[PDB]
């Protein structure tokens, strides 16, 4: 179940390249988390944020404008994180699809090869039956071919000694 | 559509097969040789009843001439050695019925056999493209394996960098809330 082809080799590779010095000992679940956590540190602040507008919206009734629009340039500068976080977590979604299904083709491949083998080893057994079997074949013409003539020739002599036979018990009745 | 032979062993069969097929089996056919036995198996068949037939008389004659032995002795003496005869006779015909029935046999094992080498033959020559396509398969697989590592390596790099923004200004927004947020409480 090992490696061998300079094509499984390769791809094996890039596996262990992966397990060995991105991923490191941190399954997919691991990382996905990770993302899932800071998107809810996220989610948090904008609440905050929005909470704490909530309380500026209502004391302004001016000092203070510009927190409404520099905090609200903030609002845009947040959305666009909370983008980029959201749009990370796909990626490393689409990261652990590509990598088990890295793992399953390499597997399969190396099947695929041993199951190629085998049905070359049946084809093979089957390509020697098939003679063997037009021997046998050759082997029983050859034969019946041996048996043709002992009989034709016998049959007349019989038919005769029958022939003489039927006369020796006719004559007695005399 | 590929059913050529290709393999040294496929060819060996092939050849054997085509052999038997052109300078044999167009030099005379497989039905020809059945009706040509069963003729002669029949006539044999014949034979036999009319020996069994007269054998028949002989015993029966012979019976009846029983009932005055000492009368009829000469006469029962030819009786029983002619018996004895068509026994001796019997058995002979018996082999060559036998002989016949074999030759019967063997020619349908001919075509049994011949049959089944057809068959075989086919049924490898599939069996190798099966195994062709498999390791051909079995490639596209390794290659797949690869490019999906690679896909991969490529996801994570741009998950890895598009965390970083978020990261890196998380706690520099919280300051910015909460100074925002104590200059609410006093004014």
Not at 40 to 46: N, T
Not at 69 to 96: P, R, V
């Amino acid at each position: 179940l090992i490696p061998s082809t300079n094509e499984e080799k390769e791809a094996d590779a890039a596996i262990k390249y992966l397990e060995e010095n991105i991923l490191k000992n941190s399954k997919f679940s691991e990382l996905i988390r990770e993302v899932r956590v800071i998107k809810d540190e996220y989610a948090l602040i904008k609440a905050d944020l929005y909470d704490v507008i909530g309380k500026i919206n209502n004391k302004k009734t001016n000092k203070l404008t510009q927190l409404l629009q520099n905090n609200l340039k903030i609002d845009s500068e947040l959305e666009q994180l909370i983008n980029m976080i959201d749009m990370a977590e796909n990626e490393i979604s689409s990261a652990a699809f590509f990598f088990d299904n890295a793992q399953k083709r390499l597997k399969e491949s190396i099947i695929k090869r041993l199951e190629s083998k085998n049905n070359r080893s049946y084809a093979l057994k089957l390509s020697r039956q098939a003679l063997s079997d037009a021997r046998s074949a050759l082997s029983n013409l050859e034969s019946f071919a041996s048996k043709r003539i002992e009989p034709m020739v016998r049959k007349e002599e019989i038919k005769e000694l029958i022939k003489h036979a039927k006369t020796v018990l006719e004559s007695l009745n005399k």
